[PDB]
């Protein structure tokens, strides 16, 4: 959601002495401690975020400052006087006090509204409003840049509809938008798509297990019709001539028709048609019987070929050859597929081939996949064009099996039972395939193309017992889509999009952290130990307070029972050294700009590169613009004093010394450190002096005490103060003049402009273009 | 120190992944420190 900022955040504060002889404007912008020995860019990152909070920049926003204005009472003056920034009245009072001290006349009537009308609101050509006010240099730069970065995502509503017009299905009622929203509508949206590949590639077993289980959970809850299989059993019984007082093979098939595990097999069937390669397998009994041959034939006929592996194919052929060709398992252990194919065919069994599954293209573009076409396998290897099984020769193959003599020379007991069984199985599939085809289409729409191409069956938890194969196809049920289930799918499609979205952000955050936190690993004990300790510190920080990663990924990473903290640490290991492309977001750009300005302009935030310590009896050039008494600031650090280059000493060497008494008498410049400092400008006239001593000398080293300046204004004819400064104070400290200060005479430089967009724009919170049917 | 919860969690996870009572019951963590001593030495 966008935020309207009502007031421009100026930071200027004006300080003036009691006499009014001097005045200056300052940009506070806070004061921040900076350390040494640690890289400054890393320290600038945390301060940059805190600065954005101070300016109200961090969250997406648009400026609303058009309404803040007033009009002067004069007839001619139709200008829109602004009410933001440093008020021109405050500047007018400061100048009038300044003119009083010099005994000059006060500002003229004509000069008053020249000054008072500098802050204006004027319209722009594009309908926007431009606000000109007195603001700080740093505040203007950061706020203007933040507005530019956020405005990229703010796009017209009609543009958004064009980008999502491909993914909208044809079964949802179109949304009607008000005419105002069409002409003057804008939407804040991030149109980047984050790939889920880093999570899936590194963690294939965990990601596949999480998605298959949730998908299986929904499919198992689908309604189905309830039709008794007594009619099918009677047809099977009559064809086989089943008797109560005999032992036939039809009894063994009939005995174990269990439909208890039907919903799980139904879910497995949809999963095979959903994904490119969802391999399933079954383990047959030690001594195969009429069921295993019936179950094995059912898999080969009515399952996608891509879902059957080469090893599983040979295993099914071996089981059929054992029962029909009547040979031991050890005999056909080394037999190839072709050898097993030939032995079965000579016996009279032709169902020795796997059949590919015809692919049906999706009607609309899949989610999280731009410019791509979806596809899924049609269930039961049925050609949509011909509404038949792929093998057009199935009917004669069934007859061939029935006349074939397997497991016995006299009688067709084995052949008739299997052929009569496959008659019903083919009839059931040829009637109920349309419902399963729609069900696969609904669930395939949830998964993206990357998950379609990557997810693989690894855990092997989705295995089907031979009893379930022959009972599922014999007792196949029509899929009935109740309104409750239709509504339930609409609910599931909601969080699937939301959970995909939150995973993309979590990966992008994780990839960015890895690049900066860690580096390459060598083959030494030192490098290994450094990685072990550093990574533990990172993993402890991310999980402290609010975790950086949402609970959505934690569920994926903990699917094996591993603790979430350990799961993320192991994933961060594989992510080091990645070449995965990450797109710089608007927020990342904003912090980098502040980080650059923090390093470039160190005076705004309260630290300096170098300081100077010189004896009082040496006169150095100082900044006399502000009129401070013994001004502690310099325009630049003097290169040469008294014709000799000023000595430069680094901080570490300075702390290390014992002749510190010999070098202070000549003066020096301390560099190679970040000197935090502070000052308090006072309106009265007094001695400018440091708050504590300059340096502390111990038996270990020499350190510089904290720098706090008590700056006072200067009056030339104050003999008491002149003697005090020259005599009492013996040593002085000098730093570069802070850039935040600005003399009152140069107040025109504080003028800055801001752009607040048109007030005719309306913002659409929910840009969805379709309505649920019911 | 050796924690028996890690063994139980690993057995539970692998039991659901694939019966597994052929080796799952035979797993005992009694001699863990000695084997760790040999691993470091090797």
Chain A with chain B: Cβ pairs closer than 8 A: 12
What is the three-class DSSP state of A619? coil
Q: Which residues, in sequence order, are CB contacts of A69 under 8 Å at separation 6+?
A: A80, A81, A82, A83, A121
* DSSP three-state, residue A237: helix
Distance from CA of B16 to the nearest CA of A (A): 7
Interface with chain B: mutation pick from A560, A563, A564, A567, highest number of B CBs within 10 Å: A560
B9: chain A residues, CB-CB within 8 Å: 561
CB contact under 8 A, A461 and B13: no
How far is A583 from A324, CA to CA, in rounded Å? 61
Query: Strands A689-690 and A154-156, how do they pair?
Result: unpaired
Q: Are strands A648-650 and A668-671 parallel, antiparallel or unpaired?
A: parallel
Residue to test with chain A: of B17, B18, B19, B20, most A Cβ within 10 A: B17
Enumerate the β-bridge partners of residue A181. Answer: none
Question: Chain A contacts of B13, Cβ < 8 Å?
Answer: 560-561
The DSSP code for A742 is E
Residue in this structure with the two tokens 């093979």, named with its chain if needed:
A249
Q: Rounded distance, CA A569 to CA A592, Å?
A: 27
CA proximity to A137, closest of A299, A25, A295? A25
Interface touch A461/B17, C-beta < 8 Å: yes
A763: which DSSP letter? E
Burial of A222 (0-12, 13-18, 19+ CB in 10 A): buried
The DSSP secondary structure of A569-617, one letter per residue, reads: HHHHHHHTT-----PPPHHHHHHHHHHHHHHH--TTTTEES-EEEEETT
Resolution in Å, one decimal place:
3.0
Element (H, E) at A251: helix A249-255
Using the structure block, give the residue that is written with the tokens 């120190």.
Answer: B1
Q: How far is B33 from chain A (nearest CA, A)?
A: 22
Strand partners, A770: A174
Contact flag B17-A561 (C-beta cutoff 8 Å): no
Question: By C-alpha distance, which of A550, A440, A557, A543 is closest to A489?
Answer: A440
Method: cryo-EM
Backbone φ and ψ of A399, nearest 5°: -65, -40
DSSP A585-596: PHHHHHHHHHHH
The residue ranges of DSSP E strands in A97-182, in sequence order, are 120-123, 129-134, 154-156, 173-174
Concatenate the DSSP letters of all residues of B1-42 into one string: ---HHHHHHHHHHHHHH---TTTTTT---TTHHHHHHHHHH-
Residue A131 contacts residue A756 (beta carbons within 8 Å):
yes
The chain B residues in contact with chain A (CB within 8 A) are 9-10, 12-13, 16-18
Interface probe, candidates B13, B14, B40, chain A, greatest A C-beta count within 10 A: B13
> What CA–CA distance (Å, rounded) separates A560 from A227?
40
* Residue A150 CB-density burial (10 A; 0-12 exposed, 13-18 middle, 19+ buried): buried
Taken as a whole, chain B contains a residue count of 42
How far apart (Å, rounded) are the C-alpha atoms in residues A483 and A489?
10
Residue (of A104, A117, A466) closest to A298 by Cα position? A466
Partner-chain contact A561 B10, CB within 8 Å: yes
* Chain centroid offset of residue B6 CA: 8
Residue A177 · residue A485 · CB < 8 Å = no
């Amino acid at each position: 959601e966008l935020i309207k900022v009502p007031t421009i955040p100026h930071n200027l504060v004006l300080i003036q002495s009691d006499n009014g002889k001097h005045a200056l404007i300052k940009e506070d912008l806070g004061q921040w401690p900076v350390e040494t020995g640690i890289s400054l860019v890393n320290q600038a990152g945390v301060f940059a975020v805190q600065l954005a909070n101070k300016l109200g920049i961090d969250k997406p926003f648009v400026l609303d400052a058009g309404s803040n204005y007033f009009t002067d009472t004069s007839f001619i003056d139709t200008r829109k006087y602004c009410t933001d920034g440093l008020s021109p009245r405050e500047i007018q009072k400061a100048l009038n006090r300044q003119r009083a001290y010099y005994d000059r006349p006060e500002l003229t009537i004509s000069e008053n509204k020249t000054l008072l009308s500098q802050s204006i609101i004027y319209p722009d050509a594009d309908g926007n409003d431009v606000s000109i006010i007195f603001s700080g240099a740093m505040s203007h730069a950061i706020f203007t840049y933040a507005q530019s970065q956020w405005n990229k995502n703010i796009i017209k509503l009609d543009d958004y509809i064009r980008e999502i017009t491909l993914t909208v299905p044809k079964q949802y009622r179109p949304r009607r938008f008000k005419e105002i929203e069409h002409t003057h509508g804008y939407v804040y949206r991030e149109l980047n798509q984050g790939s889920l590949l880093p999570l899936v590639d590194a963690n294939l077993k965990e990601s596949s297990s999480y998605y298959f289980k949730k998908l299986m959970s929904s499919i198992s809850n689908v309604p189905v019709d309830a039709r008794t299989l007594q009619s099918a059993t009677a047809a099977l019984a009559a064809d086989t001539g089943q008797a109560v007082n005999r032992a036939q093979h039809v009894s063994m098939l009939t005995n174990r028709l269990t439909t208890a595990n039907a919903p799980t097999v139904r879910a497995i069937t949809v999963l095979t048609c959903m994904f490119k390669q969802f391999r399933i397998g079954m383990t047959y009994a030690l001594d195969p019987n009429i069921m295993d041959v019936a179950a094995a034939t059912c898999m080969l006929l009515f399952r996608p070929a891509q879902s059957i592996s080469d090893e599983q194919y040979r295993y099914c052929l071996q089981t059929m050859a054992v029962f029909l060709t009547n040979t031991t398992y050890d005999i056909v252990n080394n037999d190839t597929i072709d050898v097993l194919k030939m032995k079965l065919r000579n016996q009279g069994w032709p169902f020795v081939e796997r059949y590919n599954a015809v692919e049906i293209d999706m009607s609309v573009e899949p989610l999280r996949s731009p410019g791509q076409v979806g596809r899924y396998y049609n269930p039961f290897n049925i050609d949509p064009l011909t509404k038949k099984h792929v093998e057009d020769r199935l009917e004669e193959f069934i007859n061939q099996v029935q006349v074939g003599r397997f497991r016995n020379a006299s009688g067709n007991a084995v052949g008739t039972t299997l052929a009569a069984f496959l008659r019903a199985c083919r009839d059931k599939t040829s009637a109920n395939w349309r419902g399963y085809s729609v069900l696969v289409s609904r669930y395939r729409s949830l998964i993206p193309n990357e998950l379609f191409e990557s997810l693989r069956n690894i855990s092997g938890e989705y295995n089907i017992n031979p009893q379930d194969e022959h009972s599922f196809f014999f007792a196949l049920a029509q899929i009935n889509a109740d309104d409750e289930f239709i509504g339930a799918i609409d609910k599931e499609s909601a969080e699937y999009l939301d959970e995909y979205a939150t995973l993309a952000r979590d990966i992008s955050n994780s990839l960015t952290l890895v690049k900066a936190a860690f580096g390459p690993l060598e083959r030494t004990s030192g490098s290994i130990i450094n990685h072990a300790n550093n990574l533990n510190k990172v993993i402890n920080h991310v999980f402290a307070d609010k975790p950086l990663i949402s609970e959505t990924m934690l569920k994926i990473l903990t699917i094996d029972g591993t603790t979430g903290k350990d799961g993320y640490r192991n994933w961060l290991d594989k992510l080091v050294g990645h070449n995965y492309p990450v797109y710089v977001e608007p927020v990342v750009n904003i912090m980098n700009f502040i980080s650059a300005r923090f390093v470039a302009d160190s005076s705004y935030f309260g630290y300096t590169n170098e300081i100077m310590i010189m004896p009082n009896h040496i006169n150095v050039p100082v900044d006399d613009r502000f009129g401070f008494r013994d001004s502690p600031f310099c325009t630049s650090l003097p290169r040469t004093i008294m014709g000799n280059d000023v000595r430069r000493i680094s901080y570490n060497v300075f702390s290390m010394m014992e002749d510190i008494d010999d070098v202070i008498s000549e003066g020096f410049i301390l560099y190679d450190a970040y000197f935090n400092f502070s000052y308090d400008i006072m309106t009265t006239d007094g001695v400018t002096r440091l708050k504590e001593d300059i340096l502390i000398v111990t038996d270990t080293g020499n350190d510089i005490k904290p720098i706090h300046f008590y700056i006072y204004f200067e009056n030339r004819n104050d003999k008491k103060l002149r003697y005090e400064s020259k005599m009492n104070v013996s040593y002085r400290l000098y730093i570069k003049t802070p850039a935040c200060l600005l003399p009152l005479s140069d107040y025109m430089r504080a003028q800055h402009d801001y752009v607040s967009p048109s007030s005719s724009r309306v913002y659409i919170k929910d840009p969805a273009v379709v309505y649920t049917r019911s």
